[PDB]
Write a protein that binds this ligand. Structure first.
Ligand SMILES: CC(=O)N[C@H]1[C@@H](OP(=O)(O)OP(=O)(O)OC[C@H]2O[C@@H](n3ccc(=O)[nH]c3=O)[C@H](O)[C@@H]2O)O[C@H](CO)[C@@H](O)[C@@H]1O
Ligand SMILES: [Mn+2]
Length: 342
C-alpha cells in the first residue's frame, strides 16, 4: 500500500522548510512518494522544488488564468485558485498516478517526527471503518498548555474536519470530485451534505504545525490561534499500538460513557482550578451562548462550522486545562448538530 504525500505549493520558497522535514523523517521513499503540485508559476519556488531532484515529483497546475468570481467574492479570488488547484492536484494523484489514498500537506506545514508512522498506523482504520472519512494530524485546540504531553499517543474521533495534514481514500475523492466547489473547499467539506455524519481521527498533540504567516488568508486567524498549535516532538510508534479503540462501535460506547460518567463541574471552578481532586470533568453547556462563553472562558477555539465546534465529537470538545482533563459537553440528550449555531 503506497501512500503518497501530496504537497500543495504556489509562490512561497519556504516550501523548502516543508520538504526538508518530510524528507528528513520519511522512513521509506517507496512507501511514501512525495508529489509536489505547484500552482502559480512562481519561478523561484519552482527552482527550489526542482533542486530536490529525484527526491520528489514536481507537477504544475496547467491553468494559470484568472478566475471569474461571483459578485460577493471580489476580495476572495485566492480561495477560488486554491480550490481549482486542489481539484487538479487530487485528480492527478487518483486518476493519473492512480494511488489508493494520499496525505495532503500544504507548503507551510512542518511535520512531526512521527508524521508518517502516524499515517501508516491509521490508514488501515480508515479503510476498515466507513464512518471515518479522514485521518488528520491536527488538533484544533492543540496549544501547549491545553494538551497532555505525557500522552503523545492518545488519539480521538472528531466531527470537525481539521485538514492541515490529512489522509483521504481514493473512495472519498470519488465522492467529492463530482461536486467540488468553486471556493472555500475546507468549510464546504464541513457541511453535512459532504460529511454525512462521518468523523476523522485527530491526535491529542498535533503532527503538523503551520508557519504560513503570510498567505492567501489574512494573518489574524494565524496570529491569534494557528501559530500556537504545538508540534509533537516525542516519537510514538503508532504502528506498534492497538488502535481498535478508535473504531465507531467501541469509541461511541466507551468514550461517551467516559465523558458522561465524569463528574460535572461549574465552569468557574475549572477556570480558577478549584476542586483539583477532580482530574477529569465535564463542563456542560446547554445553548449557543453558554457554549461560546464557556469555550472562551477556558481558551478553546469558539467558532463553529455548520454548527460543529472545533475538535468536537457529538458536540463534546475535549482538552487539557491547567492539568485537568476537561470535556466541554452538551447534555446527554444531544441528538445531532444545528447549523444555525454560528
Ligand atoms: C490553516 C488553514 O486552515 N489554512 C487553510 C486556508 O489557507 P491559508 O489561509 O492558510 O492560505 P495559504 O496561502 O497557506 O494557501 C493554502 C494552500 O493553497 C495553495 N495556493 C495558494 C494560492 C494559489 O493561488 N494557489 C494555491 O494552490 C498554497 O500553496 C497552500 O498550500 O484556507 C484554504 C481554503 O481556502 C485551505 O486550503 C487551507 O488549509
Ligand atoms: Mn497557510
Amino acid at each position: 500500500a503506497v501512500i503518497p504525500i501530496l504537497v500543495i505549493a504556489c509562490d512561497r520558497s519556504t516550501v523548502r522548510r516543508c520538504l526538508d522535514k518530510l524528507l528528513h523523517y520519511r522512513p521509506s521513499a517507496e512507501l511514501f512518494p512525495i508529489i509536489v503540485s505547484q500552482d502559480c508559476g512562481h519561478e523561484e519556488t519552482a527552482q527550489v522544488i526542482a533542486s530536490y531532484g529525484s527526491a520528489v515529483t514536481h507537477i504544475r497546475q496547467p491553468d494559470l488564468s484568472n478566475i471569474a468570481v461571483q459578485p460577493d467574492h471580489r476580495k476572495f479570488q485566492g480561495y477560488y485558485k486554491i480550490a481549482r488547484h486542489y481539484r487538479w492536484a487530487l485528480g492527478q494523484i487518483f486518476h493519473n498516478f492512480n494511488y489508493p489514498a494520499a496525505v495532503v500537506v500544504e507548503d507551510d506545514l512542518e511535520v512531526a517526527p512521527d508524521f508518517f508512522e502516524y499515517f501508516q498506523a491509521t490508514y488501515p482504520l480508515l479503510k476498515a471503518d466507513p464512518s471515518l472519512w479522514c485521518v488528520s494530524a491536527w488538533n484544533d485546540n492543540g496549544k501547549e498548555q491545553m494538551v497532555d504531553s505525557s500522552k503523545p499517543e492518545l488519539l480521538y474521533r472528531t466531527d470537525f474536519f481539521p485538514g492541515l495534514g490529512w489522509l483521504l481514500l481514493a473512495e472519498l475523492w470519488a465522492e467529492l470530485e463530482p461536486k467540488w466547489p468553486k471556493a472555500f473547499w475546507d468549510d464546504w467539506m464541513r457541511r453535512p451534505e459532504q460529511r454525512k455524519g462521518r468523523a476523522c481521527v485527530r491526535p491529542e498533540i498535533s503532527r503538523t504545525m503551520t508557519f504560513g504567516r503570510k498567505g492567501v488568508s489574512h494573518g489574524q486567524f494565524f496570529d491569534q490561534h494557528l501559530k500556537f498549535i504545538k508540534l509533537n516532538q516525542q516519537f510514538v510508534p503508532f504502528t506498534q499500538l492497538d488502535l481498535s479503540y478508535l473504531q465507531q462501535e467501541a469509541y461511541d460506547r466507551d468514550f461517551l460513557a467516559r465523558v458522561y460518567g465524569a463528574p460535572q463541574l461549574q465552569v468557574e471552578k475549572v477556570r480558577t482550578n478549584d476542586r483539583k481532586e477532580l482530574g477529569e470533568v465535564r463542563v456542560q453547556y446547554t445553548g449557543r451562548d453558554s457554549f461560546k462563553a464557556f469555550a472562551k472562558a477556558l481558551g478553546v477555539m469558539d467558532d463553529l462550522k455548520s454548527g460543529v465546534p472545533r475538535a468536537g465529537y457529538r458536540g463534546i470538545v475535549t482538552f487539557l486545562f491547567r492539568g485537568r482533563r476537561v470535556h466541554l459537553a452538551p447534555p446527554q440528550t444531544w441528538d445531532g448538530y444545528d447549523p444555525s449555531w454560528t
